[PDB]
Amino acid sequence: RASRLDGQATRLQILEKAGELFAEQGLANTTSKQICERSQANSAAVNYHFVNKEGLYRAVLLEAHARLVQLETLVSLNERPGSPQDKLRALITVLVERLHNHPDGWALKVLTREVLSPSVVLKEQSFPKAHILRGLLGQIMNLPADHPTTLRSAISVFAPCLFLLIAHQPLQGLSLEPQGLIDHMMSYALGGLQAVAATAHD
């Protein structure tokens, strides 16, 4: 709807649309005009709440952090009983659902893009330590959650999803459809995990 310039509805609307824009196009490529256009807000509203494009981006990074931790909290707590495989499938499903047309997508794309490249610079305290993934991977391979094979497997499993979140137009035109992507990732992951667990147990 129409909201007072100084209110929190206007601040949130600007924050979220600039989140989407920044997740698409990075900081440097995005303009004041593009932010105002997508947010449907005057430059006065933007400046009132965020001072400038850099202040807005820093707000976006803070909110993205909060939303990543909310999703980490929601995953740890909504853990349905099941096989380690079915849990890994549910975790991968959460990620794949956030790749296209998801309200939380922009938080993940902004943060993963910032974790690859820096710029308060993103070099502070701790983040989510992928506790639930490493736990699942260790159970699937029967190795401790901080066994070296488990740490490497974490990269082998999440890196493709991270890659898909931030790819722009590198993608020979294969379909976005989540089921075929989830089934590939599960079959591939269980094949690779089984192989490296065998080596680690030899």
Would you tell me which residues interact with a copy of itself (CB under 8 A)?
25-29, 113, 115-119, 121, 126-130, 134, 146, 148-149, 151-156, 159-160, 162-164, 166-175, 180-181, 183-185, 187-196, 199
**In terms of CB distance, is 2 or 126 closer to a copy of itself?**
126
User: In the complex, what is the shortest distance from the CB of residue 31 to a copy of itself, in angstroms, rounded to a whole number?
Assistant: 12
**What single-letter DSSP state applies at residue 51?**
S
User: In the complex, what is the shortest distance from the CB of residue 9 to a copy of itself, in angstroms, rounded to a whole number?
Assistant: 31
**CA 198 to chain CA centroid, nearest Å:** 31
Phi, psi of 24 (to 5 degrees): -70, -55
**In terms of CB distance, is 37 or 183 closer to a copy of itself?**
183
Burial bucket for residue 196 (CB in 10 Å: 0-12, 13-18, 19+): middle
**In terms of CB distance, is 42 or 163 closer to a copy of itself?**
163
User: In the complex, what is the shortest distance from the CB of residue 107 to a copy of itself, in angstroms, rounded to a whole number?
Assistant: 16
**In terms of CB distance, is 86 or 163 closer to a copy of itself?**
163
User: In the complex, what is the shortest distance from the CB of residue 133 to a copy of itself, in angstroms, rounded to a whole number?
Assistant: 10
Distance CA 128, CA 6 (A): 33
**CA 124 to chain CA centroid, nearest Å:** 18
User: In the complex, what is the shortest distance from the CB of residue 53 to a copy of itself, in angstroms, rounded to a whole number?
Assistant: 13
Distances (CA, A) of 104 to 65, 96, 164: 11, 12, 15
Distance CA 95, CA 83 (A): 19
